[PDB]
Design a protein around this ligand. Structure first.
Ligand SMILES: Nc1ncnc2c1ncn2[C@@H]1O[C@H](COP(=O)(O)OP(=O)(O)OP(=O)(O)O)[C@@H](O)[C@H]1O
Ligand SMILES: Nc1ncnc2c1ncn2[C@@H]1O[C@H](COP(=O)(O)OP(=O)(O)OP(=O)(O)O)[C@@H](O)[C@H]1O
Lengths: 392, 390
């Protein structure tokens, strides 16, 4: 056990509280880092101590690399930690969808370890190669508490299995730490993994959800539920209707404050609304339109899309985050594709600042076309694209 | 007996021919109702509509949706009108009223004889009890009234329904069909905010509803046209039929409909068909992708233009140029899935390719209203028709 003074310094820092030192030492003991060599059988008091001191960490992507995916030949994107917002502006032909929907592939594999069954969700498909190459690769570097996590989703084509191979060596531990933390305590907060594609507005209506619509089955409202159907890109308002019914039925303070917080999440957004109630009789959900009357089946599609999006995000953050003062302060990644979809042009100047105002702990990697989306965004947050190339 | 109105009897244009039915037929006011030249004039005013145009004159909305009362006169000299506004002002309400009137018009024009949609419970203003959707049509200078109005029961008939004009329009079109079985039926279609959504080839095969033989006639263009979905699967089936004939040649329709799509696209070419997986080939920048392998903005417009081209192709069978048809085509959210720069060429390409189609479109992007006449812009802000034509 050759112990440098750095080992003792990191040990003292870990006692004071720092996940980074704990995970670094858990790698050190059992390896050759500063010698030492395997001392304990496994995770003596280092990985378990990290799991105990697992709180407040943000699951944020830091570096992605595309190699012959979609129409590209090579791409090296660089996000940042101090800024919780990434906006990808370009045109149809210069792929920012091949950035968002290239990160969702790795996010599916992370979802299938974070809290679900361990299984490979998506891989690189033949309709994804650049019509003529044989090797493809997407690399993602998750950064939790300041420690990197490699990902290689590289595929192969027959006859060329020599330099491309998948390596899930970081997400095999990023989820294991969370499982250990959940073993330590049951009320730990897991991050949110979510993508929202162009199809957000699809299936947002109370058509027959008061009747046979496949939600009639009993529902288990645990922490693992919010991870189901998250990376399909469709906002679930029908399930929000089920949750809203259940919470108000129980309401008739801890069982009531959730709906108040979720509703105030929307009220801080698109204005003029208050006192949203249901219809026990076979009518539609009712919401105010500057205090006369209105229902949800009769709305504007900007209202509809914003309502569905924010309802889904708030409901998943409430499920994922256990009893806490502010359940909406959860961490994770929320991918919004085509954010400039059905919003009046005076909204595409406040949609992003309010998203990072109310839900102010989640990185938002969004894609847009209208320049007005960038009107409230610094120049360093913007990534222009042209002919498979990235400009500042 | 007869005044100088023998002028209109000088075999005048369709305006005079139709005006010599209402008078000079029945009504016993002007000339004795002989009833013979009335039938002869109905027969005459069927071949006269060789180069006619169908537009919408003006609409009256009263308590339908948010609008308490609004009257706008759609200019007919210009073949395009734009309804710019924010969200919550009533751009789609104006379009949805015309879509509930065009349903009744298509019910008479198509092989249908029954009626269509109507005002229902939810689509009536909160507090009031009578609705009013009056759409006045014009066909070669003749004005055709319409009133789709219904009211809640218990009141002394404050509103009623009158369907006089569209019956006459359908009658004259049917009479035109009886003589020459190609009379350039006007196109009726709304394109809602949910175009595309079915422009993927992930599933198109023998396992879906597009498997039975479908009759290609001018009445086929009225199926699901007002629903608001770009029926790309049926276009794929039609394209398979047309390419099969070209392979059987061992057919200028395909060239025309394909050149219609290339014009709207900045460097797309060479649409062919894959036989094994059944998906469409497209060549951008001379690298061959597949129809599913584009952007949503490069697929929505592809489906939209392909659909419009095929509807005019079936609707004007024997015309030398099938795209020179007439219609009341509506697009909601034209700026959807478009560049800040492609929102410029979107209107002129429609104007050049479709020179006799009226486009009552809605948008909220300022970049769409460039190079467009200022007197065709309807800013429906608040609850009126505040116009900014300078
Ligand atoms: N009594 C009412 N009935 C129906 N709608 C009403 C009523 N009162 C107010 N409204 C409002 O009128 C609004 C209609 O606004 P509008 O037509 O501009 O939507 P839109 O943004 O144009 O839709 P689209 O994107 O499809 O074009 C509804 O959102 C609805 O909230
Ligand atoms: N397998 C491929 N081979 C060659 N080129 C491809 C391939 N896949 C995609 N491309 C091209 O690369 C471009 C990038 O694709 P994509 O459409 O997803 O970008 P995008 O316009 O930003 O999408 P969105 O509008 O949803 O944001 C496409 O326009 C497409 O033409």
């Amino acid at each position: 056990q050759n112990l440098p003074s750095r080992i003792t310094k990191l040990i003292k820092k870990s006692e004071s509280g720092d996940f980074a030192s704990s995970y670094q030492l858990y790698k050190v003991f059992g390896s050759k880092e500063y010698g030492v060599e395997p001392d304990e059988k496994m995770s003596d008091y280092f990985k378990e101590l990290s799991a105990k001191q697992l709180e407040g960490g943000q699951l944020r992507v830091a570096d992605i690399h595309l190699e012959n995916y979609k129409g590209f030949e090579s791409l090296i994107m660089d996000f940042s930690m101090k800024k919780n917002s990434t906006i990808l502006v370009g045109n149809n032909g210069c792929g920012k969808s091949t950035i968002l929907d290239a990160i969702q592939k790795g996010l599916t594999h992370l979802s299938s370890r974070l809290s679900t069954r361990s299984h490979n969700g998506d891989g690189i498909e033949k309709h994804e190669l650049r019509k003529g190459q044989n090797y493809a690769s997407i690399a993602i570097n998750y950064d939790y508490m300041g420690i990197r996590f490699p990902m290689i989703i590289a595929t192969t084509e027959p006859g060329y299995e020599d330099r491309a191979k998948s390596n899930y060596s970081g997400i095999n531990e990023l989820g294991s730490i969370f499982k250990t933390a959940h073993s330590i305590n049951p009320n730990v907060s897991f991050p949110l993994i979510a993508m929202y594609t162009v199809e957000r507005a699809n299936d947002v209506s109370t058509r027959d959800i008061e009747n046979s619509e496949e939600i009639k089955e009993a529902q288990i409202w645990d922490k693992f539920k919010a991870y189901n159907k998250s990376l399909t890109g469709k906002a679930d308002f029908k399930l929000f209707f089920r949750w809203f019914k259940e919470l108000i039925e129980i309401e008739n303070s801890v069982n009531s404050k959730t709906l108040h917080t979720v509703e105030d999440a929307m009220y801080s957004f698109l204005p003029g609304f208050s006192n949203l109630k249901l219809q026990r009789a076979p009518l539609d959900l009712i919401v105010d339109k500057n205090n006369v009357s209105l229902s949800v089946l009769q709305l504007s599609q900007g209202e509809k899309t914003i309502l569905a999006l924010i309802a889904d995000i708030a409901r998943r953050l409430t499920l994922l985050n256990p009893n806490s003062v502010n359940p909406l302060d959860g961490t994770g990644i929320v991918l919004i594709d085509e954010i400039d979809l059905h919003l009046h042009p005076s909204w595409q100047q406040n949609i992003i600042p309010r998203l990072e105002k109310t839900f102010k702990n989640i990185q938002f990697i969004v894609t847009t076309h209208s320049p007005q989306v960038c009107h409230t965004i610094d120049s360093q947050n913007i990534w222009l694209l042209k002919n498979g190339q990235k400009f500042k």
